[PDB]
Structures are given as structure tokens and as C-alpha cells.
Amino acid sequence: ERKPVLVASRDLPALAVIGRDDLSVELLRTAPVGSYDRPEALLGKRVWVAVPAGSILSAATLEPGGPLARTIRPDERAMAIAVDEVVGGGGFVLPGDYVDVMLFVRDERDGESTPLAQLVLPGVRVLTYGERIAVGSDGQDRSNQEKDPRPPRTAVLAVPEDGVARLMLASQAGSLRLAIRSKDEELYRREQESAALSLDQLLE
Amino acid sequence: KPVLVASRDLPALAVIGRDDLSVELLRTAPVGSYDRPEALLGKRVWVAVPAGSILSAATLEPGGPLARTIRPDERAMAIAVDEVVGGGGFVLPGDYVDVMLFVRDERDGESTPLAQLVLPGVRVLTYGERIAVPRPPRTAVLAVPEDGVARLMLASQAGSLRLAIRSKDEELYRREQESAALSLDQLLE
Amino acid sequence: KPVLVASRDLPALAVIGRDDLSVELLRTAPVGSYDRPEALLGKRVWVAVPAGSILSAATLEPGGPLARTIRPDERAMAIAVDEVVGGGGFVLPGDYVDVMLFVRDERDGESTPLAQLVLPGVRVLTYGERIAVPRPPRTAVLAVPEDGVARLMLASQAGSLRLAIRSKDEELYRREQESAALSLDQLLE
């Protein structure tokens, strides 16, 4: 009726080895899939991600992976770009948003310089903005809560495999900016189931 | 000590009733846990929650505020602002502005100043640290039509931008909720 | 006072029993000496110890931690990282990464920026001050295949490097336990 489930009695850091002092036993009505019944099954194993106090010990916590790798899919990658207030919508971008990446470059191919602007990546989910991170299928938030809030300097995006190179070029060949997309498009729900413009065309 | 637990499997994008939740007494309560059942009644889970799991961080809406103030045919983008650029520090969110550009052409080996209007009637979504649904402002976020994002990027990076404020008596919010380039030759002579 | 000495000639790479040891009481005990016989039972001497010698520092493993985390067909190399390179400080040891390179290649008298994937699926052994055998991180150690070592070195010095994290659902750790470059012309078209 009331099954035993093992939980953490203290704040286990990342890359820690479990002893008998860290574990505790509790009696519940339902045992989650992935839980353990006796302390001897978990002794000597390594937790590969931080476990807050009181958390139910799970099998997936004892496998190689990081906070970023637990919030993506096998057909995506996670890469970071340098951001400021102008690039990131005045500091109003939070994880879960969908953005378009715009590039400004000054080509120097045929002995002459030409400013240009293009759209490189449409509809990209934002995983981290600053010290805040998204929530994966595990239902756990792993945002670094620290005092003295410094302005954000980096953001991590979920990029398809074919575009990881295209972003990298755009990050170093010129300047980047982010354009936010509307919430009424429901790109989040749907995922749970261009010609370059020159100054000659702009100036009449 | 009290902690909420999922009694059955809750699928993605599902509302919460009293049958779904249970209360269990644990020695330590994790960060993010909820005590009374009424605190999670009517809310929606955004990831799948297997049975018996402690409920936390799955009831938080993914997204930001800027995405809640535009329409599917618009985008939100930010530009750099100073006191000269935006209305002497008298521009507030909820206004309508025209974007003007000054650039030096640099074609055919002769430089030529120019001035031109790039985007008319754009709605201001944020002025510095001010949003609607003692430090000088540094940026402003506007709601651009989907065909004008590249134009604004090119204008912002190629030259200098200024904002011209439009009148309140034009009723540009009701209509929402239903040329050429001047050169120094034309000005001087 | 009590000090442990050897009773017979102990050859290299030999385990220690109760017959090989003796206890002698000396006025001064040198640094590195062991007081009780059970402190050295089961340990191994890594250099030859002649008879009557005071036992110290011959019972210490020669080696470091990194060499215990790789296989005969792999090597360990360090690369320089910042927050942009290493995913905003959310990369831990045990993760798998792809290495991407940006270089400005010059063979014709004209410079052409390029981007390319150098190494796919590389385990991360150490992130700064973190190992599985404050101050911002500066280096990260990777387990490279033996044929790719040189390929990393060039990429580390000829241009800029970035890391792309792979998903946990791919299950590359269980697997371990048993293209063309893109130029600015392709992007701007």
C-alpha cells in the first residue's frame, strides 16, 4: 500500500558520491518510475547533476549529462551567442521565447564595400538568458540564483543541426540582433506535438 | 512538511483538478513545492508529469512579456536611444513615432549626405525600464511590421536614427484595433 | 619513536605482507615514515627497496588523475574557454560536445571567412576546477581520439573555437561502453 522511496537529506553538489548520510527513506502512496527502494542500490554511485534537498532520487540523475543537455532533443544543439541590451530586446527576453536572428555585415568581395542585412535563423527557442534556464521534461529548474545581479552577457539557443555552422559565421562576420515573435502563434504548443537588402534598395 | 504530489499521470497542457493532486507529509520540503491544494487549482502544467512526482517548476509559463504585446504579423525589436534621438526624454510607451535616417552614401567615390523616412507610425512598446503589459534610458523597443525588420537593422547600423512623435488626435490606436531622399543639393540651392 | 623498516630485499612492483616489514624504535622519526604495520599492508612499492631501509615515498603511486579517465586509443588535451565558448557556464563534466571553428583563410591574396565542424561527440573530462575521476573558469580538458589531436591544435590556434552541446537522449555514453565548409557567399544569397 504505502511504498518506500529514497530521497536526499541534504544538498548534494554536482559530481558527488553518495554515502549513507546523504540518503533518507520516506513512505508514500505512489512510487515514481525510476525511484529506488533500498539504500544499498545507491551507495557508491555518482550524481552527475546537483540534487536539491528533499528531491526524490531518480535513475536519470545517475547518468552522464548536464543542465543544458537535459532540455533539448536529439535533432538539436545548444550554442551560445554574445548579447547586450540592444541585441536582447532591452533585457526583456526570457527562456521559452521564440526569436528571429538578423545579421548585419559589410561585404568586401569585389574591391568595394557594401552594407547588408539578412535573416539567417527563423523561429528559434531561447534556452538561457543570463543566469536563467528553461525547464525540461524532468520538471526541475536549475537557474543559478545569486546575489549582486550583474547585467546579462550571454544567451543560449536551441539550433537545428543544419544551422549550427550558419550561426557561427553570423556571430563573427558581423553584428547580430534578435526579433521576438508573438505568443499567439503558439509555436510552443506546435513543437510539443531571405533575400538580402542593400543600401541602394533602401535609399530610393 | 506538507507537499503536493501528482496522483495520476498528467499529460502536457492539462488543467488541474482536485482529483489530480494529493498531499504527503515529508521531513524536508524542496524549493518550489506548494503546501495547500488550492494554490495549484486551475493552473496548467506545461510538461508531462509522471505519477507520484513532487509538483514544482512544471506549473511555470514559458515566455516573456514582450511576446504578449504584439500580433502574429509583427515583431519586437530594440534600437539605441539618447535624449536627442527620442523626444527629449518625453517619449512614453503607447506612442507612435516615425523613424528618420541620416547616412552618407559613399558610392562612385564621392560622399553625399542624405535624409529619408524609413518607417512611419511605429508603436513604442518599451522606453528604458518602462513597459505596459535615476539612470538615463539606453534602448527602446518598437513593434515593427514583419517586412520592415531588415530595413530597420540596416538603417540602425548604417547611419544615424531619429524619432518624430505623431499627434494623439490622429487616432492611430483605433485604426490598429479596427517620398524620395533629400540631399544637400536640394536644401542649399 | 616507532618507525617501519624493510626486512628483506623487496623487488619492484611487489605487494607488502607482514613478513617483509619490521619495527624499530628511533629517536627521530623522518618525515614520510609510517608508525604501524597495518598502514602499509596491501600497498605496493614502485621502486626497489633494499634491506634495512626506512620505508617512505616508495609506496606512492606515480601518476595523475587525468590518465585514469581515458582509454589507450584516446588522449587528453586542454582548450581555452570563456562563457561564450562553453555554453554560458552550464557545461559540466560528462557532457558530449561538438567543436566548431571560425577561420579567416588567406590563400590567393583575398581573405574568406569560413566555418566548419572539426570534432563531433567529444567527452568533457574537466571544466575549470571540476573533475570526475569563486573564480571564472579558464580551461576545459577534452578526451580526443588519437587521430584528431593535431586537428584540434591547428583549430585552436588558426582561429576561434566554439562548443555545441548534444542531447542526453542520444545515449552516447552507452555507445562508448559498446562536411563542406560554409562561406559568406552561401549565407548571403
Automatic annotation (TrEMBL), chains B, C:
Parent-record interval covered: 56 to 268 of 303
Signal peptide: none
Highest taxon listed in the record's lineage: Bacteria
Protein name, entry field: RcpC
Domain SAF positions: 1-61
